[PDB]
Design a protein around this nucleic acid. Structure first.
Ligand SMILES: [Cl-]
Ligand SMILES: [Cl-]
Ligand SMILES: [Cl-]
Ligand SMILES: [Cl-]
Ligand SMILES: [Cl-]
Ligand SMILES: [Cl-]
Ligand SMILES: [Cl-]
Ligand SMILES: [K+]
Ligand SMILES: [Mg+2]
Ligand SMILES: [Mg+2]
Ligand SMILES: [Mg+2]
Ligand SMILES: [Mg+2]
Ligand SMILES: [Mg+2]
Ligand SMILES: [Mg+2]
Ligand SMILES: [Mg+2]
Ligand SMILES: [Mg+2]
Ligand SMILES: [Mg+2]
Ligand SMILES: [Mg+2]
Ligand SMILES: [Mg+2]
Ligand SMILES: [Mg+2]
Ligand SMILES: [Mg+2]
Ligand SMILES: [Mg+2]
Ligand SMILES: [Mg+2]
Ligand SMILES: [Mg+2]
Ligand SMILES: [Mg+2]
Ligand SMILES: [Mg+2]
Ligand SMILES: [Mg+2]
Ligand SMILES: [Mg+2]
Ligand SMILES: [Mg+2]
Ligand code: NA
Ligand code: NA
Ligand code: NA
Ligand code: NA
Ligand code: NA
Ligand code: NA
Ligand code: NA
Ligand code: NA
Ligand code: NA
Ligand code: NA
Ligand code: NA
Ligand code: NA
Ligand code: NA
Ligand code: NA
Ligand code: NA
Ligand code: NA
Ligand code: NA
Ligand code: NA
Ligand code: NA
Ligand SMILES: [Sr+2]
Ligand SMILES: [Sr+2]
Ligand SMILES: [Sr+2]
Ligand SMILES: [Sr+2]
Ligand SMILES: [Sr+2]
Ligand SMILES: [Sr+2]
Ligand SMILES: [Sr+2]
Ligand SMILES: [Sr+2]
Ligand SMILES: [Sr+2]
Ligand SMILES: [Sr+2]
Ligand SMILES: [Sr+2]
Ligand SMILES: [Sr+2]
Ligand SMILES: [Sr+2]
Ligand SMILES: [Sr+2]
Ligand SMILES: [Sr+2]
Ligand SMILES: [Sr+2]
Ligand SMILES: [Sr+2]
Ligand SMILES: [Sr+2]
Ligand SMILES: [Sr+2]
Ligand SMILES: [Sr+2]
Ligand SMILES: [Sr+2]
Ligand SMILES: [Sr+2]
Ligand SMILES: [Sr+2]
Ligand SMILES: [Sr+2]
Ligand SMILES: [Sr+2]
Ligand SMILES: [Sr+2]
Lengths: 172, 160, 142, 132, 337
RNA sequence: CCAACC
RNA sequence: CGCCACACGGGGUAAGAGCUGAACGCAUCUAAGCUCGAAACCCACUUGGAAAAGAGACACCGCCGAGGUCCCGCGUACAAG
RNA sequence: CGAGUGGCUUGCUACCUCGAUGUCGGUUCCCUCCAUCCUGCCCGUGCAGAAGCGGGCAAGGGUGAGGUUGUUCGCCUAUUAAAGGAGGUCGUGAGCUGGGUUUAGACCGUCGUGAGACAGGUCGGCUGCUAUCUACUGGGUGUGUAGGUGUCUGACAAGA
RNA sequence: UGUCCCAACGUUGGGCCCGGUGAACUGUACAUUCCAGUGCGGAGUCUGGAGACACCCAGGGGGAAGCGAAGACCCUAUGGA
RNA sequence: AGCCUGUGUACCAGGAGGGGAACAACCCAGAGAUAGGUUAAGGUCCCCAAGUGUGGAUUAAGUGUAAUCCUCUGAAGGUGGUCUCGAGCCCUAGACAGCCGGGAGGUGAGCUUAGAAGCAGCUACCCUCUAAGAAAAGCGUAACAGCUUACCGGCCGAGGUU
């Protein structure tokens, strides 16, 4: 099978070996697309994903390679963003960005600060109780968002009662 | 007692009641369920539970499978639903158990079982096109209580 | 420390067992062989099960001893020894005229033996001797 | 528990008979167990200055005898070491009966108590006549 | 039901044989952080005494109070970093590449080695620097030796030689740092490396006891009660089950006990001085008198008096440093009594 | 449990 | 029976929590990819270890003499050795 | 009701051993298994919390002291994070013990005309050997690598 | 009251080294073994691997279903007392 | 049961040699000596003589690389893991899914009830506008409200579904 993806005018896509790099006004994203007998390549103004095999396993990755590339297109132009709302009940939760990691303090009244390192060149901006995660690499951005949320996960007590934590509000 | 002790046909046919005494009573409550005043011909659908391996089924197992099957047909079609199911086999084979080492080992009589050849119909139901899946479900439950794997074969039924 | 090898084999991207089988055949025919870039040799399959097997060999043992190698260096050589009657005279001689190296200590480039090459573009389930060694706890000196 | 403030060489074991240094009506106590303790194979459970122990009353008033109670070791013959290196030892081994809250069941204590025991059990201390 | 119980003795210090080098050999060194510096020193055990100290611990209920502490007096005179050895990285690990020696040698270093008469410190240095440019240089260490003569209580004059890694800033900087030391005469001291209050790991060959039985050597029980009068008093029950049909090396048996290398971790250095402040009246038993560079190590140190002990900056400290503890008293009371 | 006679 | 000392930190995982993600336009923690995650695995630490047969490395000394043995006084050592 | 796994119990068989492979319980000392009692990390809840209850990963470490009884098991007591189970000739008598069992003496009950019998009870009642080989714990002498001194490397190996 | 917790130090005679004296038990053969398997189902010797340079000293006894005694139990004998 | 006890037969016993890792009776094979040659069972990547043989397909579990067997396990039950073959129905008059828009009036049906308005219960379940839109399929409310399924239209464009 063969799939052709016309690359956006705003974007330029270079690729060597199993690595593919995409660049736009919003930045660049490089990914390795490696699977048995699936050849990815840049043919002029279009990226081509093709293979001589057509079994369910191959078709699966092909469709997977496409969305990965179309996401890279989107990220280098429009960019990717996730919104998050910090919610707390009794203890005022302090959420701040320090260096390459978002730090949280006074979670449920904890003396020890919880933290996580931001992935990629992902940018994290907080405005009061709102938080926005964004960048060109959907992988790094999506994970950073997820990490922030997971960072306030609780297994010890009934969540329905203890709901404090930062949550993903909007997904791109 | 495990069925592994009696599921195989590895002994002579032992059914002559004129030469066997003390045979326990069968636990099978009924062989004809549903509306038995009606004929099987009055139904558009006929589904049978077919055994895939030749085996012996102790009367205790027949009662369990028949029960968990019909019980479902009652719960889903009512104590008087328009259907009829039949358990066409009867436990004629008398079983023993040697319960004194290997001396004078001929066992005492402990039960009965029905010999079923692979490919045969153990149960057969007759229903309306509506309750076709309810009977297929009653059988799924029944074949979980008898040794062999089974085929739920649909005879008259071209409503696919 | 200088090894006049009549043959220099390049194990990079090559199936370990297939190279081993041929290096043994040649060693018995009197050839002096040097296998190079062992850390890059490859073994097909699911990495998790492969490693579980080599980890078991490492854990096995007792007072008599079952010294199993962890470096790709030794892993490969042991692999070859298992294809040689190393306890017989001709077998120990063959085995002793075969050496394995991390990287390539020669100026020449090794040759790729036919039938032993693995195409990375057609295979995703395989591991690298070096990777195995690292997992085993070897000190990645290569 | 709160650091004792001195190193102790346990001078007592399960089954040891000691003096009940109070006015509860119990004269002699038998060590049965040591709170928080867990030994090793064949090792007889040991207790010393500062430990809380379960005890049974071997000698005393009818009402007290045979009762299984909690107590606190206040004195022992085996030496203990204080921060300045000096060893300290008493004339006998003695414990004070105590309740679920570690308050002395009795009203008065008899004989001296080690200061270290005071730290741990203040209410026990606020009953001591002499603290050495 | 056969209660459980940990085995007798540790399996981590074997085989329990006689040590090959009476001079300890560290098998690990501190990490490279601060400025370049020699990562170790040595001395000779003299004996013990005690000292009253002011509780330094900021988390102790006794902070600021008198505290008696046991101390082992080690005579730590100056040593001489006599050479600079360079290791290169290779497929088979680290290997010595070359050494840069000096000219000034202690008068009796010739009781152990064949002192160099003709050497090229620049050709050596040259080869080393080329190794760094190439990026094949492994760590850098100094061939070091003691000066037994400086110690009257120790009869040996023959110096003890050991290699001590040099860690520090960047390699270029500590390589230069190494070369400097060596060139002079290599004469360095305890002060140069340690500060009173820091934690050091001490290594040494324990006191020898020759052959000893399982009871003493492994801590197995003696036979008990009736089992102690039938003919067996200090012998273990059995050498193993019927199967496996062999005696495992894990069963406690008789053999060499003592005279093994041991590395004792986190020993706090209470004080580093010089003179006779720590000496004891009558002299340290079986040793003599102290009056020179000395170190007071908190607690015990492996080995008998006169044995060579080695110091290294603690590689796994549990507590932060509390420099220069206040010593209000140092016992000089006779040790005989 | 048990290590023979039942 | 006395006294001293015996981590922290890394790396990869299980169960599990998730991200991106298609087969199946959607959905999906999984099929490829990835972020995490156990007293458990590896490393860290201690001990042995040139007989590792690929039987090792470096420096200096020496080949008419470097070094060593016997011998003598002794123990930080030791059943002989 | 149906399907299995284990090889701890019991039964069955009579394949091995009667020119003998000493028998229960305990003890001592070593290795192991996981179907996990505690400890680490998780999932669910009839999960507010605290705590329970159930489930998953997981064998690194731990799982102790006592009263009756030869007892195993078990019953019981106070402690405990917990005081898990099992394999190793029901590990371990050329290691120990000798309470039980298991000769010869003796008694009771029952049985027997009697001699005498009883995994019924009861009191007493014998445990040999200087290690050849192998195995391991430690200690030496040689040869090999191939003049000497000193210093190291680290394949492997052990640890809780 | 060291039976025990929990073991320590010491004494005498041995043990160890040296001179002299100088047996016995046991011996089909080979024999440096270890892990599994196989086999009359309980192997140093068979099979597959692993390990293994030779010799010697001391040791406590895991194995040689160790040595010592044609099993005292049980059964069988047209046996004995 | 590698059990007990029959029966017919060939084998071991008393049967080598070749193969089966080893292995009384499983396979080839019945064998004077010596010699050349060709096969049998079985095998041809190395150990070890002969293929890293050819055309093709499947498997990703190291499944498997194990004729027979005390010896080689693997079951009832389950599987949108994957490959292949067939039948029915729907579809460029636009299917399946997704996303957007519409989902409306008589009327909050009648009854029951203080109240019940799609949705407590009972009964009925009719017709307007229209390209659709139930006397309402599931949540939701004290009852409303509110959120959706049906049903229709659009965007999309090729197989979809049982
Ligand atoms: Cl080993
Ligand atoms: Cl061989
Ligand atoms: Cl693959
Ligand atoms: Cl207790
Ligand atoms: Cl004992
Ligand atoms: Cl014939
Ligand atoms: Cl494999
Ligand atoms: K016998
Ligand atoms: Mg809870
Ligand atoms: Mg005990
Ligand atoms: Mg003194
Ligand atoms: Mg004094
Ligand atoms: Mg027999
Ligand atoms: Mg015997
Ligand atoms: Mg488990
Ligand atoms: Mg373990
Ligand atoms: Mg036994
Ligand atoms: Mg024995
Ligand atoms: Mg005996
Ligand atoms: Mg003996
Ligand atoms: Mg008795
Ligand atoms: Mg008796
Ligand atoms: Mg009897
Ligand atoms: Mg006889
Ligand atoms: Mg008799
Ligand atoms: Mg007679
Ligand atoms: Mg015969
Ligand atoms: Mg060949
Ligand atoms: Mg398998
Ligand atoms: Na009978
Ligand atoms: Na493979
Ligand atoms: Na191993
Ligand atoms: Na004796
Ligand atoms: Na035995
Ligand atoms: Na980790
Ligand atoms: Na079974
Ligand atoms: Na026993
Ligand atoms: Na465990
Ligand atoms: Na008991
Ligand atoms: Na036995
Ligand atoms: Na005995
Ligand atoms: Na016994
Ligand atoms: Na005594
Ligand atoms: Na032995
Ligand atoms: Na007679
Ligand atoms: Na024949
Ligand atoms: Na053969
Ligand atoms: Na396999
Ligand atoms: Sr039969
Ligand atoms: Sr079935
Ligand atoms: Sr070949
Ligand atoms: Sr050293
Ligand atoms: Sr080391
Ligand atoms: Sr005795
Ligand atoms: Sr054995
Ligand atoms: Sr996971
Ligand atoms: Sr050598
Ligand atoms: Sr015999
Ligand atoms: Sr498991
Ligand atoms: Sr737990
Ligand atoms: Sr009992
Ligand atoms: Sr038993
Ligand atoms: Sr045992
Ligand atoms: Sr007795
Ligand atoms: Sr009895
Ligand atoms: Sr009797
Ligand atoms: Sr030779
Ligand atoms: Sr062999
Ligand atoms: Sr002996
Ligand atoms: Sr081929
Ligand atoms: Sr093919
Ligand atoms: Sr068998
Ligand atoms: Sr089979
Ligand atoms: Sr199945």
């Amino acid at each position: 099978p063969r799939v052709e993806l016309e690359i956006p005018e705003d974007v330029d896509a270079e690729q060597d070996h199993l690595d593919i790099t995409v660049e736009g006004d919003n930045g660049s994203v490089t990914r390795r697309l490696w699977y048995p007998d699936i050849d990815v390549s840049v043919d002029g103004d279009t990226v081509v994903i093709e293979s001589d095999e057509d079994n369910a396993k191959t078709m699966s990755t092909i469709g997977t390679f496409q969305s990965h590339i179309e996401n890279m297109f989107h990220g280098v132009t429009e960019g990717w963003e996730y919104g998050m709302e910090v919610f707390y009940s009794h203890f005022p939760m302090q959420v701040n960005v320090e260096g390459d990691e978002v730090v949280i303090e006074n979670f449920l009244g904890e003396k020890a600060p919880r933290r996580t390192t931001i992935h990629g060149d992902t940018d994290v901006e907080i405005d009061g109780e709102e938080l926005t995660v964004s960048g060109p690499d959907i992988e790094a951005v999506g994970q950073t968002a997820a990490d922030i949320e997971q960072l306030t996960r609780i297994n010890d007590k009934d969540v329905r009662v203890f709901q404090d934590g930062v949550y993903i509000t909007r997904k791109p | 007692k495990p069925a592994s002790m009696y599921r195989d046909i590895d002994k002579p046919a032992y059914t002559r009641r004129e030469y066997i005494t003390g045979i326990p009573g069968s636990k099978i409550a009924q062989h004809k369920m549903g509306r038995k005043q009606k004929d099987a011909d009055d139904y558009p659908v006929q589904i049978s539970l077919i055994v895939e391996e030749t085996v012996q089924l102790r009367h205790g197992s027949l009662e369990a499978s028949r029960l968990s099957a019909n019980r479902h047909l009652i719960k889903e079609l009512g104590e008087e639903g328009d259907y009829k199911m039949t358990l066409r086999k009867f436990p004629h084979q008398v079983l023993r158990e040697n319960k004194d080492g290997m001396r004078a080992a001929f066992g005492k009589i402990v039960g009965t079982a029905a010999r079923v050849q692979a490919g045969e119909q153990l149960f057969t139901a007759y229903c309306n096109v509506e309750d076709a899946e309810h009977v297929k479900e009653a059988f799924r439950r029944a074949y979980n209580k008898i040794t062999p794997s089974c085929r739920i074969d649909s005879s008259p039924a071209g409503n696919a | 420390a200088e090894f006049d090898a009549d043959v220099i084999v390049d194990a990079r991207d090559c199936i370990m067992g297939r190279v081993a089988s041929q290096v043994a055949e040649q060693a018995l025919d009197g050839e002096t062989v040097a296998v190079v870039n062992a850390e890059r040799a490859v073994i097909t399959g699911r990495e998790e099960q492969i490693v579980e097997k080599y980890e078991k060999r490492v854990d096995i043992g007792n007072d008599n001893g079952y010294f199993y190698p962890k470096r790709p260096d030794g892993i490969f050589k042991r692999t070859i020894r298992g294809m040689l009657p190393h306890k017989k005279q001709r077998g120990r001689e063959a085995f002793e005229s075969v050496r394995v190296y991390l990287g390539n200590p020669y100026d020449e480039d090794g040759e790729v033996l036919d039938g032993t090459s693995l195409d990375r573009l057609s295979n995703i389930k395989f591991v690298t001797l070096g990777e195995i060694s690292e997992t085993l706890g070897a000190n990645k000196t290569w | 528990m709160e650091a004792l403030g001195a190193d102790v060489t346990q001078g007592l074991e399960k089954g040891s008979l000691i003096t009940c240094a109070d006015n509860t009506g119990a004269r002699e106590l038998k060590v049965i167990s040591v709170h928080g303790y867990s030994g090793t194979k064949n090792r007889l459970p040991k207790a010393g200055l500062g430990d809380k122990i379960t005890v049974s009353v071997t000698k005393g008033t009818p009402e007290m005898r045979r009762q299984v109670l909690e107590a606190v070791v206040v004195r022992q013959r085996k030496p203990i070491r204080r921060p300045d290196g000096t060893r300290v030892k008493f004339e006998d081994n003695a414990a004070v009966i105590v309740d679920e809250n570690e308050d002395p069941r009795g009203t008065e204590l008899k004989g001296p108590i080690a200061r270290e025991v005071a730290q741990r059990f203040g209410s026990v201390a606020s009953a001591a006549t002499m603290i050495v | 039901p056969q209660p459980s119980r940990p085995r007798k003795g540790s399996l981590g210090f074997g085989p329990r044989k006689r040590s090959t080098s009476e001079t300890p050999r560290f098998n690990s060194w501190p990490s490279d952080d601060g400025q370049p510096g020699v990562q170790g020193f040595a001395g000779y055990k003299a004996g013990m005494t005690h000292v009253v100290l002011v509780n330094d611990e900021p988390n102790s209920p006794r902070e600021g109070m008198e505290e008696t502490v046991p101390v082992t007096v080690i005579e730590t005179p100056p040593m001489r970093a006599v050479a600079l050895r360079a290791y290169e990285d290779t497929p088979y690990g680290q290997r010595p590449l070359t050494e840069v020696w000096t000219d000034e040698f202690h008068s009796e270093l010739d009781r152990t080695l064949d002192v160099p008469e003709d050497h090229d410190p620049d050709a050596a240095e040259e080869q080393i620097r080329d190794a760094h440019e190439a990026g094949d240089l492994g760590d850098l260490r100094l061939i070091t030796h003691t000066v037994p003569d400086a110690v009257p209580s120790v009869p040996k004059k023959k110096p003890d030689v050991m290699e001590t890694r040099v860690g520090g800033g960047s390699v270029s900087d500590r390589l230069d740092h190494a070369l400097d030391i060596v060139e002079d005469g290599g004469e360095h001291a305890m002060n140069d490396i340690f500060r009173a209050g820091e934690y050091a790991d001490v290594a040494g060959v324990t006191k020898g006891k020759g052959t000893q039985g399982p009871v003493k050597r492994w801590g197995v029980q003696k036979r008990k009660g009736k089992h102690a009068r039938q003919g067996w008093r200090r012998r273990i029950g059995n050498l193993g089950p019927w199967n496996p049909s062999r005696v495992r090396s894990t069963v406690p048996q008789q053999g060499q006990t003592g005279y093994h290398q041991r590395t004792e971790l986190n020993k706090r250095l209470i004080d580093i001085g010089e003179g006779d402040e720590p000496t004891v009246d009558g002299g340290f038993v079986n040793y003599g008198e102290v009056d020179g560079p000395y170190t007071l190590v908190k607690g015990s140190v492996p080995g008998p008096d006169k044995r060579l002990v080695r110091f290294r900056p603690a590689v796994r400290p549990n507590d932060q440093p509390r420099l220069d503890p206040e010593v209000r008293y140092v016992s000089n009371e006779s040790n005989q009594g």
